[PDB]
Amino acid sequence: LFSNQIIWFVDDTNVYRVTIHKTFEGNLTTKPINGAIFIFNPRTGQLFLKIIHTSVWAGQKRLGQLAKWKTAEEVAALIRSLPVEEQPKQIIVTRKGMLDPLEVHLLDFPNIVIKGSELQLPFQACLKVEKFGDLILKATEPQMVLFNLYDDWLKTISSYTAFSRLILILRALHVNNDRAKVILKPDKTTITEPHHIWPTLTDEEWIKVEVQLKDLILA
C-alpha cells in the first residue's frame, strides 16, 4: 500500500442517503438527505470530503445507480483541480460498482490505476462523529472540505500505524457505536481538541484502546 506513489481510497457508500417514513395515510415517503464522498490518502491522512446536497437529485430515478456516476464525476473534477504532481497514481474503490463509472470518467488519465478491494473501511462511521455528521446534515449546497484524519499522530508514529489505528476506530464505530465511544474515552479528563477529529490520548492509552477496539470488532 505505501510505496512511493499517491494512492486514494474512494468510498461512495454515503452519497445517496434517504430517510423513510410511514405517513398517517399509510404510504411511504422517501426523502433524500445530504450525502458525502470520502476520498482518502492513507499515507498522509488527508481526507477530501465532498458533500453532496440533495438538490443534485431531480426528477431522477435510480438514484442509487446515479450516485456511482456522480461520485466518478466528482473524483475526476477533484483530479482536474489538482496539479499533476498531486494527482493519485492509484484509486482503490471500496465498492465494485464504482469501477466502470470511474473508468469512463478518467479516460484522460491513462496512467491512473483503478482497482477494487475486499478491505473493510467503513467511512460511513464518520457520519457518527458529530464533526462530520452535523456538517453534512446542515449543508445547503455542495462543497468540499479538507480534513486530516490522523490529527497529530504522524509526529510520533508511522503512516502504517496511523492507518491501522484509523481503520480500527472506523470499524469499531461501525459495529458498535456506543461501546466504541466509551472505549475512546478511557479517562474522565479525556478530550478531543477543537481542530482534531480523535481524542488526545497518551501512548499507553492508545495501546489499550487499539486492543479493545480490535476485540469489539471480533465480538
Q: What CATH code is carried by the domain that includes residue 85?
A: 3.30.420.230
Q: How far apart are CA 77 and CA 63, in angstroms?
A: 20
User: Which cell goes with 10?
Assistant: 474512494
Query: Under DSSP, is residue 29 helix (H, G, I), strand (E, B) or coil?
Result: strand
**Which residues, listed in sequence order, are joined to residue 9 by a DSSP beta bridge?**
40, 92
Shared-domain flag, residues 84 and 126: yes
Shared-domain flag, residues 18 and 126: yes
Shared-domain flag, residues 19 and 55: yes
Contact present, 74 and 106 (Cβ < 8 Å): no
Contact present, 51 and 136 (Cβ < 8 Å): yes
3-state helix, strand, coil in the chain (%, to 5): 40, 20, 35
Q: Checking DSSP bridges between strand 90-93 and strand 17-22, what pairing results, if any? A: unpaired
- CB atoms near residue 106 (< 10 Å): 18
Q: How far apart are CA 152 and CA 200, in angstroms?
A: 9
Contact present, 93 and 12 (Cβ < 8 Å): yes
**Which residues, listed in sequence order, are joined to residue 146 by a DSSP beta bridge?**
48
Q: How far apart are CA 218 and CA 176, in angstroms?
A: 11
164 closest CA partner among 48, 45, 46: 45
Shared-domain flag, residues 125 and 193: no
Contact present, 2 and 10 (Cβ < 8 Å): no
Contact present, 20 and 106 (Cβ < 8 Å): no
Residue type at position 82:
L
Torsion-angle region of residue 3: left (phi > 0), alpha (psi -120 to 50) or beta?
Answer: beta
Shared-domain flag, residues 77 and 128: yes
Cα–chain-centroid distance for residue 6?
Answer: 17
Q: How far apart are CA 147 and CA 40, in angstroms?
A: 10
Shared-domain flag, residues 29 and 66: yes
Q: How far apart are CA 61 and CA 214, in angstroms?
A: 40
Give resolution, Å, one decimal.
1.9
**93 membership: H or E segment, kind and range:** strand 90-93
**Which residues, listed in sequence order, are joined to residue 28 by a DSSP beta bridge?**
22
Cα–chain-centroid distance for residue 17?
Answer: 14
Q: How far apart are CA 111 and CA 5, in angstroms?
A: 12
Q: How many domains does the chain have?
A: 2
Which among 127, 151, 175 is the end of a domain? 151
In the block, cell 502504517 appears at: 160
Q: Give Cβ neighbours of residue 51 (< 8 Å, ≥ 6 apart).
A: 34, 35, 36, 135, 136, 139, 142, 143, 144, 145
- CB atoms near residue 46 (< 10 Å): 16
**Structural biology method used:** X-ray
Rg over CA atoms, the chain? 18
Shared-domain flag, residues 140 and 207: no
Query: Under DSSP, is residue 27 helix (H, G, I), strand (E, B) or coil?
Result: coil
**First CA to last CA distance, the chain:** 27
Q: Domain range for residue 159?
A: 152-219
Q: How far apart are CA 130 and CA 124, in angstroms?
A: 12
DSSP per position, 146-198? EEETTTTGGGTS-HHHHHHHHHHHHHHHHH-HHHHHHHT--STT----TT-SS
Which among 151, 166, 200 is the end of a domain? 151
Shared-domain flag, residues 179 and 138: no
Shared-domain flag, residues 74 and 177: no
Query: Under DSSP, is residue 67 helix (H, G, I), strand (E, B) or coil?
Result: helix
Which among 99, 126, 151 is the end of a domain? 151
CATH number where 161 lies? 1.20.80.40
Shared-domain flag, residues 139 and 187: no
Query: Under DSSP, is residue 44 helix (H, G, I), strand (E, B) or coil?
Result: coil
Shared-domain flag, residues 72 and 177: no
206 closest CA partner among 162, 160, 173, 147: 162
Query: Under DSSP, is residue 30 helix (H, G, I), strand (E, B) or coil?
Result: strand
Shared-domain flag, residues 143 and 179: no
